[PDB]
């Protein structure tokens, strides 16, 4: 989206209730700088944060470093956004989005893209169906879960069946 300006009233939004796909933001040709301070970018997209903060502003070719340590000088301490202990990325392209990552009391919403392998039945496997975890053979079931129930539990609290989260079919786990 076009037009951008101002750093001191630099505009800022919570990013929340969405899956934060940072994957696309490497692969485009046009980014010239992408960094992280503290943790790797593919290592970012498997954490799970309450509030992803983003903000943007237009700049001149020669750019002063956006502040990792509390960087030192002129506009880089007299106009903005000076996070000494910044566990926060810095993007740029041919114009920057400086990212602060909140981990506050709230239930973490803006969470990794959760990349998903492809179902294999009738053999043995370690499975992770939506955070439910454990080894077994998944086979086609005849059980009829109600629309909102995600996993069947046996009499003695052992998981007996699951709903596959992408095709909403019920698999027994023997």
């Amino acid at each position, epitope marked *: 989206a076009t037009r951008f300006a101002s750093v001191y009233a630099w505009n800022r939004k919570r990013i929340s209730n969405c899956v934060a796909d940072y994957s696309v933001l490497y692969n485009s040709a046009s980014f*010239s700088t992408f960094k992280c301070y503290g943790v790797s970018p593919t*290592k970012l997209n498997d954490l799970c944060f309450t509030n992803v903060y983003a903000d943007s502003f237009v700049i001149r070719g020669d750019e002063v470093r956006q502040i990792a340590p509390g960087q030192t000088g002129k506009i880089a301490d007299y106009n903005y956004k000076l996070p000494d202990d910044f566990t926060g990325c810095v993007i740029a392209w041919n114009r920057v989005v400086v990212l602060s990552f909140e981990l506050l009391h709230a239930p973490a919403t803006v969470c990794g893209p959760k990349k998903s392998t492809n179902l294999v039945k009738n053999k043995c496997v370690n499975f992770n169906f939506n955070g439910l975890t454990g080894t077994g053979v998944l086979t086609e079931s005849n059980k009829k879960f109600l629309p909102f129930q995600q996993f069947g539990r046996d009499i003695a609290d052992t998981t007996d069946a699951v709903r596959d989260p992408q095709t909403l079919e019920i698999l027994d786990i023997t």
Partner: antibody, heavy 121, light 108 residues
Framework: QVQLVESGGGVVQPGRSLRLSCAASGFTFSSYGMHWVRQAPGKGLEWVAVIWYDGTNTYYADSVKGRFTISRDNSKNTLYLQMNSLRAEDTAVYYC????????????????WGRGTLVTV | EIVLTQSPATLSLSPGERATLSCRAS??????LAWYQQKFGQAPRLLIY???NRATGIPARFSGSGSGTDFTLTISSLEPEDFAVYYCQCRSNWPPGITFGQGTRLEI
């Protein structure tokens, strides 16, 4: 003495496997990203693999997708590269290279080249 | 995908004269597309990025022009410090790899 020296040039039949290594020295191995670019005889440079400075994510060119393995062990400050299912085109001068940018994930330029090790099949 | 198309196949000239290579990009490549100078056996070194921006270590004699699908390099006065082979290079988004050209040889 900021140089890389390659290692592991040799000959193998098609369908078998090979492993190369590149030694880095004079600079911080675990602070820069690394590439392997291969120069087939009489032809131009063709990127093979890259790694960001902490080896936490890796990309391969299409011609080698799912057939070669790039890895860094900072214990010895040694870069590796395994091979599987090598074919006739794979003959080349494998130049391990070092990335241009300090701690930037763009992975865009090659600022430093190894002398290149022959591999033939 | 981006395929760089390089002309002429070769250049033959005396040193001191004006050397012009052309690289016709397939489709606009935004603000960075590179030129590589490789002497025989040596390690290739960038000369120009952005197609007019003078990279560091580069004497002023090397000049480039273009945007979109016209990209051309000029050298005003050749000396043996420059007499090598030359490539035009870029990176990609559709899937994440890199395209060089085929190369353009220079002759005396």
């Amino acid at each position: 003495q900021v140089q890389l020296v390659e290692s592991g040039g040799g000959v193998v039949q098609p369908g078998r496997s090979l492993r190369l290594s590149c030694a880095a020295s004079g600079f911080t191995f675990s602070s820069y990203g690394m590439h392997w670019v291969r120069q087939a005889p009489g032809k131009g440079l063709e990127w093979v693999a890259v790694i960001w400075y902490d080896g936490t994510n890796t990309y391969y060119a299409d011609s080698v997708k799912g057939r070669f393995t790039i890895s860094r062990d900072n214990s010895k400050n040694t870069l590796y590269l395994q091979m599987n299912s090598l074919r006739a085109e794979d003959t080349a001068v494998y130049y391990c290279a070092r990335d241009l940018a300090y701690r930037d994930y763009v992975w865009r330029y090659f600022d430093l080249w190894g002398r290149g090790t022959l591999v033939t099949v | 995908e981006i395929v760089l198309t390089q002309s002429p196949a070769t250049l033959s000239l005396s040193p001191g004269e004006r050397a012009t290579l052309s690289c016709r990009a397939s489709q606009s490549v935004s603000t960075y597309l590179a030129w590589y100078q490789q002497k025989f056996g040596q390690a290739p070194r960038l000369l120009i990025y952005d197609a007019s921006n003078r990279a560091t270590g580069i004497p002023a004699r090397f000049s480039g022009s273009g945007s979109g699908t016209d990209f051309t390099l000029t050298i005003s006065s050749l000396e043996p410090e420059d007499f090598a082979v030359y490539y035009c290079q870029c990176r990609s988004n559709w899937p994440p790899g890199i395209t060089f050209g085929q190369g353009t040889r220079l002759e005396i």
